[PDB]
Design a protein around this ligand. Sequence first.
Ligand SMILES: CCCCC[C@H](CC(=O)NO)C(=O)N[C@H](C(=O)N1CCC[C@H]1CO)C(C)C
Ligand SMILES: [Mg+2]
Ligand SMILES: [Zn+2]
Length: 891
Amino acid sequence: EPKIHYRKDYKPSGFIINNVTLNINIHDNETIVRSVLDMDISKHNVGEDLVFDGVGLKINEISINNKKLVEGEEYTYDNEFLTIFSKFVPKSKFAFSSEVIIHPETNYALTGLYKSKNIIVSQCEATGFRRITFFIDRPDMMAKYDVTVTADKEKYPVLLSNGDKVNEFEIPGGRHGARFNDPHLKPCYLFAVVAGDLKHLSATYITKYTKKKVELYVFSEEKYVSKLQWALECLKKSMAFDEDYFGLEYDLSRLNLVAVSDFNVGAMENKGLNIFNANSLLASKKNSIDFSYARILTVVGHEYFHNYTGNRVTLRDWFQLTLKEGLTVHRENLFSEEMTKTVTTRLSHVDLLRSVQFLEDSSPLSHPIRPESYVSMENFYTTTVYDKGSEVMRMYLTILGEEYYKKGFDIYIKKNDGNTATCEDFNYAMEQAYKMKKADNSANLNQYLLWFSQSGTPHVSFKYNYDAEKKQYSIHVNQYTKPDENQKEKKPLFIPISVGLINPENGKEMISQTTLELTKESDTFVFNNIAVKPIPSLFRGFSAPVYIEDNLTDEERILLLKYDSDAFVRYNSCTNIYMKQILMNYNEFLKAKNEKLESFNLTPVNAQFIDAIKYLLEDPHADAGFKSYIVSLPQDRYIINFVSNLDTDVLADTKEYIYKQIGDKLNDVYYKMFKSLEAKADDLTYFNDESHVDFDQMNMRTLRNTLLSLLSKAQYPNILNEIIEHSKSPYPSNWLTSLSVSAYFDKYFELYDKTYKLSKDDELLLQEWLKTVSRSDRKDIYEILKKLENEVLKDSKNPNDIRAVYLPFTNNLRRFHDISGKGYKLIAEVITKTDKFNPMVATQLCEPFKLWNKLDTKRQELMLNEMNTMLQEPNISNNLKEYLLRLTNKL
Ligand SMILES: CCCCC[C@H](CC(=O)NO)C(=O)N[C@H](C(=O)N1CCC[C@H]1CO)C(C)C
Ligand SMILES: [Mg+2]
Ligand SMILES: [Zn+2]
């Protein structure tokens, strides 16, 4: 809650920075940064003081045009802003020079310049460049960079910054230097530097259309150079995809990707020098679980795609974040759907959005994808801006279709290349394409802007009529968004509804798929020549980011699950059956608890639904990934969107009942499929080949591991033998599952020791092991956390370690939410501890408190007490204070 920046207040700077010439001299106990800004006065200038951002800098010298400026007389510096009084600021082109001292060796917040293990590395987005040197540190201040880095040669043999390496030189005293020129105008947030004893793999890529030769290097510490192979393949895939779908080619002679051990987020798109959390760049089949492959593909792609949507077209201001992030996520999703060719890839996104993003959008943190105000920009790198952003960017492709979408996208890139841009710029481009598609210059996408400005998730509900004799069917649709703090009156959105109509007698499609365009609060869509009463297949591919109220019977939903063509509608039909059941049994258990009944009834799971699950499971031509979705209940964070004053214990009992009802019918089926899938699931074709992954085979393993979990909880006879055997697989996805599912057996602690010994000498694998323990369904999980703290985590400041120990545990419904509040106290203590050195990670660890006002009134109180205690810690960070104030309804 200090200074609050507002979106309508945007004004261009009174100043211009045209070039940046940096020298960065790294020493053991200090790094010295000399910087010349070649600057000018803008047409917006009104003779104001020249104010630079600069945070924690120790000033050696400051000058303008070779004249030394002095503290008190010519400048003030308060550790956050440097003010050059106007009477000493020139009125035409001038050279500002500064030299400062910084200390990456003691920078544990991992913003600005820092040391990660033995690598020196920067992270500048959003406001980190000001921790390196003085700057007008905002994205519309675009300049060209000339960067020299020096260091001890033995410790830091490899020196990297943005763009072309133009010189390498030796320095007396065992030092060396490298100079880089980046020809592309950029904002400072895309500046990067790395120095280290790095090893690499490389390739040359030739661009499709202009035949530009591009050198591709991927880098890590020596211990893990062999884990770089997949990344380099993913980069080549990415490049090809942007050329093939978007006609976009890379624009420098060289592209480097670098892994570092300590990183607050996944990776960063610094021009020509993308930097990664090692967990999102490094893998090997012997030392990584499966999910690493899709992770790396996603993150390499995402950061590559930013070359156009973020770097060549950048942001005017930070309120426009979703323009680069939503759009880049949508680009990556298209890429990943094309690379994987599995329906589970779209389903995984939808599952994330409806759980994590819907929760945010009904919390006190709710915001539109283009926010109106902020305090710490770091708090607005949200699932809203990324995920709901991406669904907003995706709806344009749904509305326009592939050809006109690619047209609109080209107009956007062409118009804004080399410049900053706003969300309205993108909409205007898509609007040009829309007019072309409707053949009508009066068509507009003004209404579509409300996807940017209006917060909250729309609810879309349905009523059906069929006239048997006229062969006529109608779908009446209503949309509603719940008023909130951002808008007391909500407006109808442009909602695309992809639909099919299934004949329930034969399972066949009755119409060409079509996209209904709902733009009013309600509308009735009518279909002729509908030969029988259909079942509607609604929101195919999850065509808009909404709460779908299908108004279907379970019988109808079963028919969709079995016979519809669309993976999402099939999965959603299943999800809705589960949700009806959960809500019903939750209410039954809740009445029992509150009225202290001695006896009561529970509604049984629909038997035909069960049969339908069985039929799907036993179908050898049905997709293994899809099957894993059908046997899993909806996520807790999805469910909670449907329940007020949620008693988490009652929910836990509800889920256990339902899983047991299903298992009591299907466990023999589960076991037969677990055994029959083994040959194809665990086949070792390509186990030595890091350039190729079979994602279908991976989904077979996921299914096997899901079934093993289900069978383990049920205590299926002799399943312990199957778990033991599974712990000998060469696939870490399997042997870490073995640990997980062994939670329900006396052998857990044997498998804990065994898998720890298998994980401990690979830092990323050890982190996957920590996650596995943390997520284990153990009665003694609090004592197991203490053991991790004492034996493994200890004093680590590595965010991947901290996150791995605590975050999975916070998803343990029964234990995290223990009615004592001990879980809440435990995570609050970790947040407070962590905020003292890394505020961004501290705010990340507050994730489980986002649903506090959705819980039962005792749990609500217990969470609020912990948040209020954290807010009382002295020297709480602005990141964490802002976050908690907003979450608790004070800001
Ligand atoms: C998923 C998109 C690609 C990953 C990289 C993005 C960062 C980004 O936008 N780079 O350009 C990120 O870290 N995003 C966050 C992220 O992946 N996080 C933040 C903490 C670590 C990591 C999840 O474990 C998500 C949660 C928004
Ligand atoms: Mg470590
Ligand atoms: Zn991004």
